[PDB]
Amino acid sequence: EWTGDARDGMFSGVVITQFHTGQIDNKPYFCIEGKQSAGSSISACSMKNSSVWGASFSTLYNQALYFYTTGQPVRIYYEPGVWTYPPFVKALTSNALVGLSTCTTSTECFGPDRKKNSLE
Amino acid sequence: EWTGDARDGMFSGVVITQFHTGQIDNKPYFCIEGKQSAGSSISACSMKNSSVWGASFSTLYNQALYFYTTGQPVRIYYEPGVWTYPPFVKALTSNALVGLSTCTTSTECFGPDRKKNS
Amino acid sequence: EWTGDARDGMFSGVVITQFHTGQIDNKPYFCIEGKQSAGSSISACSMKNSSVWGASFSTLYNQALYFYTTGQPVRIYYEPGVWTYPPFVKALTSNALVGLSTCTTSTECFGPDRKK
Amino acid sequence: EWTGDARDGMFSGVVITQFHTGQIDNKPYFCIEGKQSAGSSISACSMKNSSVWGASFSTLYNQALYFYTTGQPVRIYYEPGVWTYPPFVKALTSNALVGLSTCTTSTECFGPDRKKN
Amino acid sequence: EWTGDARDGMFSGVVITQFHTGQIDNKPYFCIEGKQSAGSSISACSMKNSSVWGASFSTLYNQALYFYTTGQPVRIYYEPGVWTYPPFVKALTSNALVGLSTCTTSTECFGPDRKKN
How many degrees, rounded to 5, is the angle at CA B61 between CA A53 and CA E62? 85
Q: Are A53 and A96 in contact (CB under 8 A)?
A: yes
Residue E22: other Cβ atoms inside 10 A: 30
Total of domains in chain B: 1
How far apart, in whole angstroms, are the C-alpha atoms of residue A9 and residue A76? 9
How far apart, in whole angstroms, are the C-alpha atoms of residue B65 and residue A92? 24
Dihedral over alpha carbons C20, C21, C24, C28 (to 10 degrees): 150
How far apart, in whole angstroms, are the C-alpha atoms of residue E31 and residue D110? 9
- Contacts of B57-64 spanning 24+ positions with Cβ under 8 A: B57/B28, B58/A28, B59/A21, B59/A28, B59/A30, B59/A61, B60/A21, B60/B97, B60/B99, B60/B100, B61/B30, B61/C59, B62/A61, B62/A65, B63/A19, B63/A21, B63/B100, B64/B16, B64/B19, B64/B30, B64/B32, B64/B97, B64/B100
Instruction: Count the helix, strand and coil residues of chain B and give each as a percent rounded to the nearest 5.
Output: 20, 40, 40
Residue B37: other Cβ atoms inside 10 A: 11
How many degrees, rounded to 5, is the angle at CA A103 between CA A101 and CA A104? 150
**Chains C and E are touching, with contact defined as 3 or more CB–CB pairs separated by less than 8 Å:** yes
B59 touches chain A (CB under 8 A): yes
Give the three-state DSSP class for C102. Answer: strand
**What are the φ and ψ backbone dihedral angles of D9, each rounded to 5 degrees?**
-175, -170
How far apart, in whole angstroms, are the C-alpha atoms of residue A46 and residue A83? 10
**What are the φ and ψ backbone dihedral angles of E15, each rounded to 5 degrees?**
-90, 120
Nearest residue on chain B to A31, judged by CA atoms?
B111
Count of helices and strands (H, E) across chain C? 2, 5
Contact E21 D52 (CB under 8 A): no
Structure determined by: X-ray
Strand partners, E109: E103
Q: Are E99 and C20 in contact (CB under 8 A)?
A: yes
Please state, in angstroms and as integers, the Cα–Cα distance from residue E66 to each residue in A35, C85, D96, following that order.
Answer: 33, 29, 27
Strand partners, D5: none
* Contacts with E25 from chain D: Cβ below 8 Å: 1-2
Give the three-state DSSP class for D39. Answer: coil
Residue D86: other Cβ atoms inside 10 A: 9
Contact C110 B22 (CB under 8 A): no
SS3 per residue for A34-100: EECCCCCEEEEEEECCCCCCHHHHHHHHHHHHHHHHHCCEEEEEEECCCCCCHHHHHHCCCCEEEEE
Specify whether the backbone of C94 is left (phi greater than 0), alpha (psi in -120 to 50) or beta. alpha
Residue B25: other Cβ atoms inside 10 A: 12
Contact D99 E23 (CB under 8 A): yes
* Contacts with A58 from chain D: Cβ below 8 Å: 28
Q: Which amino acid is at D18?
A: Q
- Residue numbers of the domain that contains E98: 1-117
How far apart, in whole angstroms, are the C-alpha atoms of residue B46 and residue D86? 45
- Of E19, E14, E64, the C-alpha closest to E40 is E14
Resolution of the experimental structure, in angstroms: 2.1
Nearest-CB residue to B4 (from A28, A30, A91): A91
- Of C80, C26, C81, the C-alpha closest to C49 is C26
R_g of chain E computed on alpha carbons: 13
How far apart, in whole angstroms, are the C-alpha atoms of residue A101 and residue A111? 6
Contact E111 C31 (CB under 8 A): yes
DSSP string, B76-93: EEEETT----HHHHHHS-
How far apart, in whole angstroms, are the C-alpha atoms of residue D59 and residue D70? 17
Q: Give the domain CATH number at D95.
A: 2.40.50.110
How far apart, in whole angstroms, are the C-alpha atoms of residue A15 and residue A5? 23
Nearest-CB residue to C66 (from B33, B65, B91): B65
How far apart, in whole angstroms, are the C-alpha atoms of residue D115 and residue B81? 63
Contact C87 E2 (CB under 8 A): yes
Contact E4 C87 (CB under 8 A): yes
- Of D25, D37, D16, D1, the C-alpha closest to D101 is D16
Give the three-state DSSP class for C32. Answer: strand
Q: Which amino acid is at C31?
A: C
Query: How many CA atoms, within 13 angstroms, populate the side-chain half-sphere of residue C32?
Result: 30
How far apart, in whole angstroms, are the C-alpha atoms of residue E42 and residue E24? 21
How far apart, in whole angstroms, are the C-alpha atoms of residue C99 and residue C84? 20
How far apart, in whole angstroms, are the C-alpha atoms of residue E18 and residue D112? 13
Give the three-state DSSP class for B40. Answer: coil
- Contacts of C89-93 spanning 24+ positions with Cβ under 8 A: C91/E4, C91/E111, C91/E112, C91/E113, C92/C20, C92/C31, C92/C43, C92/C45, C92/E4, C92/E111, C92/E112, C93/C31, C93/C43, C93/C44, C93/C45
DSSP state of E72: -
C26 touches chain E (CB under 8 A): yes
